[PDB]
Amino acid sequence: LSTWQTFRRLWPTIAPFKAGLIVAGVALILNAASDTFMLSLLKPLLDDGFGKTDRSVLVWMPLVVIGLMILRGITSYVSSYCISWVSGKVVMTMRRRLFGHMMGMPVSFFDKQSTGTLLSRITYDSEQVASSSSGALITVVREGASIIGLFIMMFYYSWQLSIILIVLAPIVSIAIRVVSKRFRNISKNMQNTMGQVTTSAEQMLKGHKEVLIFGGQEVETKRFDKVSNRMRLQGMKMVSASSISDPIIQLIASLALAFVLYAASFPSVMDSLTAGTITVVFSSMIALMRPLKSLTNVNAQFQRGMAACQTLFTILDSEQEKDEGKRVIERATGDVEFRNVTFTYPGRDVPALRNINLKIPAGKTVALVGRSGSGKSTIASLITRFYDIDEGEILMDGHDLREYTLASLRNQVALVSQNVHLFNDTVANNIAYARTEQYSREQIEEAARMAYAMDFINKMDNGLDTVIGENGVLLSGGQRQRIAIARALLRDSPILILDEATSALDTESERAIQAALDELQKNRTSLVIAHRLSTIEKADEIVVVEDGVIVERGTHNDLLEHRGVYAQLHKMQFG
Amino acid sequence: LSTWQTFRRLWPTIAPFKAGLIVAGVALILNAASDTFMLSLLKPLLDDGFGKTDRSVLVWMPLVVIGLMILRGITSYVSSYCISWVSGKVVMTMRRRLFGHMMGMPVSFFDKQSTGTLLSRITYDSEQVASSSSGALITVVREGASIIGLFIMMFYYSWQLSIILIVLAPIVSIAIRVVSKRFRNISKNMQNTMGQVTTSAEQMLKGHKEVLIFGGQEVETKRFDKVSNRMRLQGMKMVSASSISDPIIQLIASLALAFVLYAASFPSVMDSLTAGTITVVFSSMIALMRPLKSLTNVNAQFQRGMAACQTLFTILDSEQEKDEGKRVIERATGDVEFRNVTFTYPGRDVPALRNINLKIPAGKTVALVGRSGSGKSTIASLITRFYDIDEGEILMDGHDLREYTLASLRNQVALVSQNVHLFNDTVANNIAYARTEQYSREQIEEAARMAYAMDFINKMDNGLDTVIGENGVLLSGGQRQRIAIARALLRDSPILILDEATSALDTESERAIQAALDELQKNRTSLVIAHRLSTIEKADEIVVVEDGVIVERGTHNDLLEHRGVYAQLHKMQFG
User: Fold this and answer.
1) Nearest CA to CA, how far is A53 from chain B (Å)?
2) Which single residue of A245, A249, A455, B396 could bond A183 by disulfide (Cβ 3.0 to 4.6 Å)?
3) Set of chain A residues whose Cβ sits within 8 Å of the Cβ of B228
């Protein structure tokens, strides 16, 4: 199949750690050699052993046995440890490479695939790939060495009886296979007619309300007598077949053993047999049953592992987000404009946004209001180039978003909302995702105090150094919004996409939050998602977007006077 | 437990077939003895065998082996066949006894328990009881003889090494148990924190929409680096524990073997050791591992089998229908009457029938009108003493039904309806469930012709002798009703409970069936379930029963003039 090509592609990853693989292979070969050597040691125990009067062989035997098993234990430990070190580092590189290609690929991918199956791919699938490939290698080495050693021993001790056994075994195998097959076919052929004999006995017990009326009790008893005798005869026939099944295979095995003994009886083969030798042959052959029965199967599962690895490579060679365009800007003035923009979510028709025209000057704020959908969050994401418009043009300071570099454009915008991800780190580090060294502690605390964050920093230990709990357990929703504001004030941003929709209108310290917001949206473009009435009144230009098209434009008082969609949304307070 | 009491109760059933049990026991003991004797034969092939120059013991060995396995095959076949004959006859008697106790018990039981589970009890449960008990006996005999033979052989060949082995083995077993237990607990203790190490790395991939805005890709890369390194170290500890699990077991088994060899090294023991002897000892131990591992378990399952048999005894020792009262009459005149009868279905409150007064004289027919329920079919049931009134009195020719003997009262009534059970037998036999010899072929064909049954019976082969197919496939619904009418005409009945509700008004030959009905209900009391308009007009007295009480009484014209419930039922034609 194509699994070997996947292994060829994967080999460079395992290449730097070949030393561990070599050590593990040597340890496994020593393990198989120790086991085979013990089975060889079975000979001096029996032949030049008990029967002879020499006590040396019986007095140094325990030491040899315990030494060989000490070697087996040590080599098993070393092999397992080294193979798992190699597996650990291979998983290490594979996991670290997926994550490097998983935080550059566009948001559409995580929209398609949920985070749960993604974590499954990162952890469980990589672990399964490593475990399956490592197990395949472990078996192919150890069991391969074991079968080679056992064949060498069997051919070395006696070259005639070994060939006899090797020739004879497959014949016995195929014979017992054929016998068992035909017997279970007969068994099922009788099962199919028991299936109907049961419903043959079904149809008298439904007629109780009929027998008693006409007094046919004895007739029904006799009918059951006859049917029951028929049933017993059928069961006896089944059991006769099932009982003749097993003695046949037992007898053919016995006949094979008898033929082996008869062949050993012949002088041409009798000469090179001396008591315990046959044991070291026979026992060895018995041992040879276990590795082989595994060996083949293991090779098969190897392919399975590589197949799963192919899936990872599919993620590993996917398409990252396009970074076309090289225009770097620092602290843009802010001239956000949408002209005839039409956007459809990748993979979905019915454009959420179509032919909109939205001009937001610097400093002046636009409150963009609409229903729960209306593409408001689509506008928010579209400003930050998370997605790309199919048609239309977005002009930023006289240039297109696609024209601009992704990094600088993404850095310039600032997104503040109630639902902001608080990563597990210090509050000082949560103030600035990156460039933490750029902003000293005094700047961080000044920004926190300006956004009124400093109040809840000192409510816990270590102040600014307070580590954020797992999934932000330490901070609550209002404090989450506040730390988002502090993040915004720390890094001045020409363009701010405020999202008051998720902001709690029933929480505490709302006056402080609103004041911090007011200080935040000073002398900078503010594309505010309009949910609360207060934000709209203080805003400069109020724009209503519904069904992907603009429906009302103008100031808040003017829109209220227009008595259009804006007035209707004002009636229930925009939700 | 109480299972042995069930076995004591069941023993009389198996008592007549003790010869088969004895033969099977002898055969099984011979089987175990043959196997043990082969393992004993393992000695001469090895001690005064290959090593010696006397090849005679090598040339008569195959003959003895093949003879022993011929004996094993023959004795296995004989044991299986005899134990299966005994099981078949025990199942035969148990099944024939349930059906003798299952066809006298009140109809309320089949109302409670469906026919499917009843058939399951008859067939599947009895088969399981027999199979489990027979398997327990077979194992307790064969494996018991095998372990006794192995022990006596081992003690006979060498009495020191045997005791040493039988003392050392349990210590090794318990040590392995303890080691494996503690290591598995360590493994699960590591699993519990795998669970959280996964979710620690869960909370990084949900921020893809946050990392890109602030340009913290490198910081996230470093964080994943550290978290992934922690994961790999935890996996290292995982593998360390999992890999130290098994070699301890292997080493302790090796130490046990070394101690056995050292004990053999002492000169106080050698005298009872001669090469192959130890094999016949050691191999015996290996063989002795298999019976014991089964023996104990089998005893347990024996109880299970007996438990199931107890359930059957519960059905076998339940309560039959009460035959209290000894009054046998033949061809009663028919003066059936219900006075203040109140009946509740056994196990249900809300009396389906309460304080009814219903007098039906000889010859004159009454029609019971009502809704789909109203207890009309229930009234039909009470007449046939299928159920019994809790309160009230049902008088037949001046005597109570309970006063009356069950056999004669049940025989006197005749139930004719569309849904009549057609048992698989000849048409001639289906016309007379019992007393088929009482009615000659001439009488049977005359009755069939009177009820117009001759038209359809001659439409098939063998005429009168045509056997009814499985579940009456040969006869259709109209012909089913017609053959029921033939049955009724064959045995004259003073009281006839006709059920025209199930009769079809969309079938063919409706004139013929109506004419046959008219001939059938002459000069005999006819409690007709009123569903068809034609029947009631021809009927003498029309009584409407609803909600368990009589609501309208009188002739059909009078009831129509009354404009009560009867007129309303006339409007939609009584259904």
Assistant:
1) 10
2) A245
3) 92, 95-96, 99
DSSP letter (8 states) at residue B339? E
H helix intervals, B363-469:
376-383, 406-412, 427-431, 441-450, 454-457
Q: Which of A139, A35, A36 is nearest to A79 (CA)?
A: A139
For residues B283 and B211, membership in a common domain is answered with yes
Q: Which two tokens stand for residue A411?
A: 């850095």
Q: What is the rounded CA–CA span in Å between residue A108 and residue A98?
A: 17
Together in a domain, B310 and B349: no
For residue B341, list its beta bridge partners: B356
Cα–Cα distances (Å) from B18 to A337, B25, B31, B228, in that order, read 103, 10, 20, 73
- Closest listed residue to residue B125, CA positions, set B309, B275, B2: B309
Residue whose tokens read 């020739």 = A167
Find the length of chain B: 575
Q: What is the DSSP string of A124-173?
A: IIHHHHHHHHHHHHHHHHHHHHHHHHHHHHHHHH-TTHHHHHHHHHHHHH
A553 CB burial (10 A radius; 0-12, 13-18, 19+): middle
Please enumerate in sequence order all residues whose Cβ is within 8 A of that of A567, keeping only pairs 6 or more positions apart, or say none: A559, A560
B384 contacts in A (CB within 8 Å)?
A: 212-213
As to burial, measured by CB atoms within 10 angstroms (0-12 exposed, 13-18 middle, 19+ buried), residue A336 is: buried
Which element (helix H / strand E) includes A365? strand A365-369
When CB atoms are compared, the residue of B100, B215, B470 closest to A221 is B100
Cβ contact A368:A379 at 8 Å: yes
The minimum CA-CA distance between A166 and chain B, rounded to whole Å, is 20
On whether any CB of chain A is under 8 Å from the CB of B507, the answer is no
Q: Which of B235, B251, B410 sits opposite A73 (nearest CB)?
A: B251
Can you list the alpha helix ranges (DSSP code H) found in A419-495?
427-431, 441-450, 454-457, 477-490
Beta carbons of B350 and B344 less than 8 angstroms apart = yes
Helix boundaries (H) for B15-106: 18-41, 56-59, 61-102
Return the ∠ at Cα A404 (arms to A401 and A408), rounded to 5°: 110
Q: Which of B76, B77, B228 sits opposite A92 (nearest CB)?
A: B228
- B18 and B105: one domain? yes
Residue B333, Cα to own-chain centre: how many angstroms?
46
Helices (H), B406-528: 406-412, 427-431, 441-450, 454-457, 477-490, 510-520
Type of residue found at B418: Q
- Does residue B329 belong to any structural domain of this protein? no
Encoded tokens for B574: 């009584």
CATH of the domain at B373: 3.40.50.300
Coil, helix or strand at residue A549: strand
Q: Which two tokens stand for residue A44?
A: 């001096």
What span, in angstroms and rounded, lies between the C-alpha atoms of A39 and B108?
A: 72
B353-359, strands of its sheet edge to edge = B353-359, B337-343, B391-396, B399-400
The range of the structural domain enclosing residue B523 comes to 336-573
Q: Residue B228's domain is classified under what CATH number? A: 1.20.1560.10
Structure tokens given for B148: 């006794």
Q: What token pair was written down for B428?
A: 């001639």
**Is residue B297 classed exposed, middle or buried when 0-12, 13-18 and 19+ CB atoms within 10 A define those classes?**
exposed
**Does residue A324 form part of some domain?**
no
Q: What is the resolution of this structure in A?
A: 3.7
Interruption sites in chain A after residues (C→N beyond 2.5 Å):
none
Q: What is the phi-psi region of residue A347: left when phi exceeds 0, alpha when psi lies from -120 to 50, beta otherwise?
A: left
* Continuous segment of H or E residues that includes residue B159: helix B159-202
For tokens 């005298």, the residue is B271
B-chain residues near A224 (CB < 8 A): 96, 99
Number of domains in chain B: 2
